[PDB]
Design an enzyme around this catalytic site. Structure first.
Site, PDB file in Angstrom:
ATOM      1  N   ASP A 101       6.474  -4.838  -1.187  1.00 12.95           N
ATOM      2  CA  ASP A 101       6.336  -3.396  -1.087  1.00 12.95           C
ATOM      3  C   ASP A 101       7.590  -2.643  -1.593  1.00 12.95           C
ATOM      4  O   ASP A 101       8.678  -3.244  -1.597  1.00 12.95           O
ATOM      5  CB  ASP A 101       6.085  -3.276   0.512  1.00 12.95           C
ATOM      6  CG  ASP A 101       5.743  -1.859   0.560  1.00 12.95           C
ATOM      7  OD1 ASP A 101       6.753  -0.996   0.664  1.00 12.95           O
ATOM      8  OD2 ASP A 101       4.703  -1.627   1.083  1.00 12.95           O
TER       9      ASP A 101
ATOM     10  N   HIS B 220      -5.337  -2.891   1.117  1.00 13.38           N
ATOM     11  CA  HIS B 220      -4.110  -3.594   1.108  1.00 13.38           C
ATOM     12  C   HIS B 220      -4.026  -4.090   2.466  1.00 13.38           C
ATOM     13  O   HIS B 220      -4.310  -3.410   3.453  1.00 13.38           O
ATOM     14  CB  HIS B 220      -3.093  -2.828   0.502  1.00 13.38           C
ATOM     15  CG  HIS B 220      -2.807  -1.496   0.982  1.00 13.38           C
ATOM     16  ND1 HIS B 220      -3.379  -0.441   0.856  1.00 13.38           N
ATOM     17  CD2 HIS B 220      -1.916  -1.272   2.188  1.00 13.38           C
ATOM     18  CE1 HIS B 220      -2.979   0.589   1.693  1.00 13.38           C
ATOM     19  NE2 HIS B 220      -2.105   0.078   2.138  1.00 13.38           N
TER      20      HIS B 220
ATOM     21  N   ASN C  31      -4.137  -0.603   7.527  1.00 11.74           N
ATOM     22  CA  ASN C  31      -4.234   1.097   7.722  1.00 11.74           C
ATOM     23  C   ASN C  31      -5.311   1.418   6.969  1.00 11.74           C
ATOM     24  O   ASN C  31      -5.707   1.453   6.128  1.00 11.74           O
ATOM     25  CB  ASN C  31      -2.808   1.687   7.283  1.00 11.74           C
ATOM     26  CG  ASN C  31      -1.563   1.079   7.926  1.00 11.74           C
ATOM     27  OD1 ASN C  31      -1.249   0.661   9.171  1.00 11.74           O
ATOM     28  ND2 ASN C  31      -0.500   1.222   7.350  1.00 11.74           N
TER      29      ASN C  31
ATOM     30  N   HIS D 288      -6.587   2.031  -1.533  1.00 12.74           N
ATOM     31  CA  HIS D 288      -6.980   0.804  -2.183  1.00 12.74           C
ATOM     32  C   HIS D 288      -6.943  -0.235  -1.210  1.00 12.74           C
ATOM     33  O   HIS D 288      -5.478  -0.246  -0.749  1.00 12.74           O
ATOM     34  CB  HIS D 288      -6.245   0.541  -3.601  1.00 12.74           C
ATOM     35  CG  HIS D 288      -6.653  -0.752  -4.290  1.00 12.74           C
ATOM     36  ND1 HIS D 288      -7.142  -0.607  -5.603  1.00 12.74           N
ATOM     37  CD2 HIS D 288      -6.390  -1.996  -4.011  1.00 12.74           C
ATOM     38  CE1 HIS D 288      -7.114  -2.199  -6.001  1.00 12.74           C
ATOM     39  NE2 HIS D 288      -6.976  -2.864  -4.954  1.00 12.74           N
TER      40      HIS D 288
ATOM     41  N   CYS E 133      -4.859  -0.523  -8.369  1.00  9.69           N
ATOM     42  CA  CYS E 133      -5.729  -0.981  -9.374  1.00  9.69           C
ATOM     43  C   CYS E 133      -4.595  -1.317 -10.658  1.00  9.69           C
ATOM     44  O   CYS E 133      -4.460  -2.396 -11.400  1.00  9.69           O
ATOM     45  CB  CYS E 133      -6.702   0.057 -10.215  1.00  9.69           C
ATOM     46  SG  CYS E 133      -8.212   0.012  -8.901  1.00  9.69           S
TER      47      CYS E 133
END
Ligand SMILES: Nc1nc2c(ncn2[C@@H]2O[C@H](COP(=O)(O)O)[C@@H](O)[C@H]2O)c(=O)[nH]1
Ligand SMILES: Nc1nc2c(ncn2[C@@H]2O[C@H](COP(=O)(O)O)[C@@H](O)[C@H]2O)c(=O)[nH]1
Ligand SMILES: [K+]
Ligand SMILES: [K+]
Ligand SMILES: [Zn+2]
Ligand SMILES: [Zn+2]
Lengths: 115, 118
Positions: free
Chosen positions: A32, A102, A89, A100, A9
């Protein structure tokens, strides 16, 4: 909306630093921190959902929007023709660590094939 | 439709498969060579070569595929335990069958394959 304790967030809303590759009013894409491929990009909604299984059916078009963005990124970064992998995942068995929604975009090398 | 496409033949019912889901738009079936206790392929009946071949205005097929994934998860119980969704696009993505498909892996604690775990 947002969750106070959620790292994504805060990345998506700019309160925690990241290296952004794409942003619109619905999603942010950023590199990442612990890449497993030369390109390892996370695409997240700005709205918080804990995981894929927590998105109501009626709201599932966030995933289509994420995919329009994935294709835009692949073309802009020049990995659309070489190829790429998209991963979500979900939950414990899926290996989800950050709760969250992704999508991982992995590209820039030939990726391993599951055997 | 493509003559040389295994998934077109599986989708139009020309070739046998073990069906997990079907509606007017999407079919899901078990992978012939599974890597997890649930290893399910979810495909549109319409042929697209890969994710990059879907025009933006048709990307709703991906949302419908994801509703299907969640419906299967809820029926089978791996909604609670977890699962992974994978799309392989093009050569370096490891795509072999050039008909849009999503893999669902579930029913065990999955390794992080791309980090080297098996
Ligand atoms: N850019 C960025 N990536 C992060 C941060 N914390 C975790 N990550 C990445 O978030 C990902 C979470 O993926 P998951 O394992 O939950 O599917 C991991 O690949 C991890 O490296 C962070 O603060 N910044
Ligand atoms: N059920 C079924 N799966 C197949 C058949 N041929 C290939 N597959 C599966 O199709 C998948 C293709 O995934 P890809 O590596 O292209 O993403 C492979 O996991 C492979 O086991 C078939 O004739 N029937
Ligand atoms: K997620
Ligand atoms: K595909
Ligand atoms: Zn969040
Ligand atoms: Zn086909």
């Amino acid at each position: 909306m947002e969750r106070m304790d959620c790292i994504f967030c805060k990345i998506a809303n700019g309160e925690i630093p990241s290296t952004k590759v794409y942003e619109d009013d619905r999603v942010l894409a950023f590199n990442d921190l612990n890449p497993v491929a030369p390109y390892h990009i996370l695409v997240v909604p700005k709205k918080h959902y804990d995981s894929l299984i927590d998105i109501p059916d009626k709201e599932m078009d966030i995933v289509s929007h994420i995919h329009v963005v994935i294709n835009k990124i692949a073309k802009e970064k020049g990995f659309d023709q070489t190829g790429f992998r998209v991963i979500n995942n979900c939950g414990s068995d899926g290996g989800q660590e950050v709760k969250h929604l992704h999508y991982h975009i992995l590209a820039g090398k030939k990726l391993p094939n599951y055997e």
